[model samples]
Target: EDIDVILKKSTILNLDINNDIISDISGFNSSVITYPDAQLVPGINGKAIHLVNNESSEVIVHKAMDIEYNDMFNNFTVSFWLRVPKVSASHLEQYGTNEYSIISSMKKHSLSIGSGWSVSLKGNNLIWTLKDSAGEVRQITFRDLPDKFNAYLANKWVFITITNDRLSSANLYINGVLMGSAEITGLGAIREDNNITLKLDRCNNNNQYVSIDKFRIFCKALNPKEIEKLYTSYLSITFLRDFWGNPLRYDTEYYLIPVASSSKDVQLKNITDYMYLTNAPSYTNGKLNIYYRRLYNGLKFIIKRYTPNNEIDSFVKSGDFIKLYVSYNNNEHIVGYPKDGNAFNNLDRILRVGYNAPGIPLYKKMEAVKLRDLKTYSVQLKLYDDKNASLGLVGTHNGQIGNDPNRDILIASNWYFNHLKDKILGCDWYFVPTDEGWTND
Candidate 1:
């Protein structure tokens, strides 16, 4: 939305880079010159292109839409998400490393043959080089700062924007903040018989690899507000707080809650979509699958999944059980069953169980009380680390997947969980045997 607000009509290119080289906008052509090792992995938004570099590896180069030298050199804004993975010297020895170009157009013809611009990373510095047709070269470098340099070294997503009007000046912005700008009084447009070719993820003889995503180019230089908006649009949400407040992070952990019920005589077998837990996270045959949902009202959690031989294998014998398990950072805990008036020590190691079992239904919404002093007196069920009570388990709803209505559940963060829990504490979950599944409301 901000992108449209900034330069809807002036936009030249937009590449989501989900699974293909096709640009999201039409009339723009893109192709991939890739090797067998080229991969598409999880990115800030979705799938991002991973350019592999090796002696035997043919570096994957993405060629974008072509535009005239004057049309691009005069006024253009280029934006993209970049991730430079840090590697040991030994790891770099195999690829034979040096400077790498995240985006460049001069690759078609070297400085001796042609004139174009490039945004490259040289050691600790990020350099933007502009070469005119007359071989006049000017560069703007952002380096020597602990904060800036460390931001690049950290293996995380970084937003980059470079704008050049050529008439006035050229500017570079990192993570929505303007790093620096350079005057271009002598610099000239890339004069050539062929239109300038935009190549992305250029290896430039550097054996190291990098990932790029959400690349875009605009016909006009964007202002600070617009640049900030564009950068914030691509930022990742990695925290989970209130029911209607902060966004949730979908990491490796899970949130399980009781939803339905079945008798012990009737086994929930071959359950490839949903799973049940007894005392432990049971593995049926070899895999276990647990499906759950996160409602606005705070109702359910899911246990392990049931898969025959796949990754989430789980199994459990038919019996009367207490509570199911919820896992965080590979550590499973007993959670689902409601309060039994028999309060056990919250810091017990017995709460940790294996991926094995079915469980009984836990808490159900009892009643609500509202006063001028207190907002709502609703029962809150919370789980945290036994070793550290500060660290807690949080859940997020990532929409639905398939037949399962709430398949996209995730555990957000350990740090945020602990921090938020310390601020907003939870009362003990008081429970008595009631219904099997949670109330629809």
Candidate 2:
């Protein structure tokens, strides 16, 4: 074959959520489960399925597979765009919404009855359940949700993807990034039955409504790049918002310096090019050393970052290698790796050490330090090749500043050195960074 037919041949289902509620794939049986408060609304695509709870009943829809879809679950990927109704404490009583299962496909029986999979949402958490032919069930829950649940997720359309590869692993992705994953060791092929149905927003107790669009299923597990392509396709059409109505907080370009390194000759430079050990920690043959580089001007750039939430603690610990990138102007600067020649010239723009990388051990010690608020500050290092470049270092704090609980700001040399004095004098900076840096203003 001239080109790969993997995508076209493996694609098993596609639901546009348009006026007719038809499956884009021919011969797929699409039917209405219940028509309670179901309407068509503008979605990430042309139209979307809006299922809401009426005074007496809940709305539901489904697709029934006749043939050519039995083995779709052997290794599969499901992609869709979803938005849930606002569920706040004040509206909790009226809504009584504890769970919202947008897509569930099961063989006409209980989890013990057939083999199928389902995706459910509850209070900003995503739950994906897979049941085998023997009725054994495996579930993966992505709890890395933002702290401000109601404010962050309510009424926001975000990309969602669930993938199961050969029944060995299950991964969940949100907004084109890997959120979490799990393993399933003892699962067999899903047996197809007339009862094997794709049900959308079918719930009896939960009264909250949900909107879904651009649903798709691939018989083969799509790789990371493939799944991200789907997100990019929709992201181009619409922009996601955070709880504060700001753009979604995906990620900022970041770099990591070796946490454990030589500190004896480490230095912190001032405007006059005078190097000092003021912010330098105790020397350790294999411990973190803060190397503060000064720009040509008097401006100082320090490696720093906003503390990521604890939700990723396990994800980080489970990794053997944490990927690093290069930076320019505090943003990721990407340059193709040279085909031939020493990569030494790119060293200043790039970051990462070999097996001597101090990520895991450093993480353990930092955790043992047990900083107050149970949060650890991450020190980032950005190598600036430009002498006139501004040295605006990112600062971290944990307190309500405006609408977000966490904040990032620029820390000056004077401020940073002064704080170092406190740290060296045996002051507990566990809570000082945020407490002394930010005010509610």
Candidate 3:
């Protein structure tokens, strides 16, 4: 019930607008649209009223007449889909000259620029330049253009949106991909003295010649999640990537590995707590055998050596085959080798074995080895008891360990380690099916 309720709550749009139809300014009924040009263009879509270039080239001026509304407070989001053959310099001037007018611009395959909307501030400008089509330099200024302006490619449709939300900050999106967000908050005012307006063909210089169609506007600032959805809905396909990296698909799953090592005598307290162990079967020449004092006061699991007793303590071992068989609750019954050790640390310091033993140490050169297409694998380790306490079988099969708060211990394992000798120290490693794991690797 809780999950269903949460899903339903997320479906509601905090702010939305669809310029399905465009008509004369007098016929426009939306309070948010001040001047909707009634003149329709020949090739424009039926959903939006087209504003043809006039003698002055001035087309439409849709204004958000309700400035006092909470939706149009200090922060807001505006978006629209446009199809234009050419954008003239004159069309850019009609937008505005004040700093609060334009916030940012996401150009097509070009640089991105952030404009400061503060009227009193003079030098608060942030701009990022990206390579253009011909590998040329293009300068973008926000004198009268929309916060986001993608180059108008002939016959192609583009969706552009900008948001200035207080909680999640400000952002801009083009064709679905989130260009980026502002480092600071409240950069521009939602309602300016000139009134927020969209003019066609006319720039801040009052020149006209640009045609616009299917223009839409919204009031509230859209979060990254919402912006992404809107982008997909309008684009009718997935928008590939954002500023961070590759776009996360709906079916991808993430696997989190804990990498922190601590004392061997330490007790794992929480389900989230884990320890690391290194120098398993593949890292050494001789089969590594780790003897766990199952009868010892705290021995909960036993990791048997992969090789015979003689090969258990050799160094510089090489083998792709390493196995981990977990014996739980002090039961000598070994599970099986090649079990997935999501991550683990080297426990050499606390163990009686020498650093020169067959298994590698935590400080040794280690790297992650990606096993292609394999969804499941086991890890094998040889548990050694230097004190030879002859501890009885007392470990658990699952090998789940917890932290002892009184000792103030921290798990110090590296969850990303995948090489030989580069084992993480004192960490609780979990078994995960490779098919269910997802990472940059």
Candidate 4:
């Protein structure tokens, strides 16, 4: 929701380069350098290009766009949809000298202090490097995956994000979740006693071709929720203990739990018009789902969506686990936890609960309890103005937005899931699984 806004305001590049498919093309510009016979083709949406494996080929540029227009270099957000081949390290693997190539980079002219950074793929991990102002080359890597490299990193179309916050934070994200983050003192403290080049698909003389689509760059760092928005609007749920901002839950179906901060009803996003969600999150294979709703009386709201088998293509990764997301409205605000956390916004507010592991369900998770405890429990959640019980007004999953902070309903989630597992927690309605799907009363 927010990332889209910042991008509109700060994007230095988006869907600008990589075009004229179905043939070989290359243009010599102070901004970009392309291979003589760079293979151009159609991307899923518009058009994309191949960077190499076509005999030492690549796309390089001077500055992050300073050559064409004024560019920002302090903090950067580089995002794109692409697929890569095998790699020994995170960088693109070339032929001679160096064993790998950076998927993308911005370097100081061969002269000046080496003050720039780059991102790439490494043994099942995504990595980044900073040619710092201190004259030292620093690196950070993201390797929190269920599986290992090659097996999980190869041959897939993934949305990769690398963000540096100017101070000491650099992060890597795969498909929108925070994979890993680190610290560096002067992330963007370089002066212009330098020549800058934002290069992609090159390192040494070697270049490994990569297929890419939809590229973007931002001058500011994107928050967890913002980065999540970049992945798409539809979302899934996972109650993880040690999750670093984004939790890992994929390869399965999630139950959509309607949540309300102050009442039994859930408000969801203010679609104003139901059609927006009734048949939303349209996919590529002509496969769009029906957002099933049992009740809609201009009052309370709840929904069911046969969350399609979602996934992404990685090396050997069959389908995609890009979880179907739940869209939001930037204009309409909702209740949430924390001055930011508890349960206000539609995301944390209207609780979307899912079992973390694909094959195993609740029974296996809270093994401390009996299967009967895991059985159907009758409980209904009522959103409440945590600070003071505002027993009435706005009774749906998405409660009324308090003009100020004093009124926002916070989803009392902390220990709530724990009680939901056994018996202590009480509420208005409870849902238990039925042979068909999930049924509540």
Estimated TM-score per prediction?
A: 0.53, 0.47, 0.31, 0.43
lDDT of 3 by residue, 275-302 (tens): 2232111111122111111111221332
Clashes of each: 39, 5, 83, 57
The CA lDDT at 241 in model 3 is 17
Ranking by lDDT: 1, 2, 4, 3
TM-score of 1: 0.53
List, residue by residue over 1-441, the lDDT tens digit for candidate 2: 211355556666666554555345523544445444557665654567665554333333354545445454567788877776444443434333456566666654444464677778655467888877777778887763332221224455667888888657888887767877878767766654433233344455344566667777776677787776666655331322222121221232221211222121212221111121222232111111111221112112221222454443321221111222233344442211111211222121111111122232211101111112111122321122223231211122112223433322111111232353232311121111111111111
The ten-residue window of minimal lDDT in model 3 covers 287-296
Residues 15-87 of candidate 1 have per-residue lDDT tens digits of 6554454344624554434455656655665567665564333333343535444343567788887776533
Q: Model 1: runs farther than 4 Å from truth?
A: 1-5, 18-21, 24-26, 29-37, 54-66, 70-73, 87-97, 108-113, 144-150, 192-207, 235-441
Deviation from truth (RMSD, Å), model 3: 22.1
Off by over 4 Å in 3: 1-38, 42-45, 49-73, 86-155, 186-190, 200-214, 235-441
Error of 2 at 114 (Å): 4.4
Score candidate 4 by TM-score against the native.
Answer: 0.43
Q: In terms of TM-score, which candidate is strongest?
A: 1
Task: Write one digit per residue (lDDT tens) for candidate 4, span 321-405.
Answer: 1122222332211122222222444343322222133433111110011111211211233333334332221112323443422
Q: Report the alpha-carbon TM-score of model 3 versus the true structure.
A: 0.31
Off by more than 4 A, model 4: 1-3, 17-33, 42-44, 54-56, 63-73, 86-99, 104-109, 144-152, 186-188, 191-208, 233-441
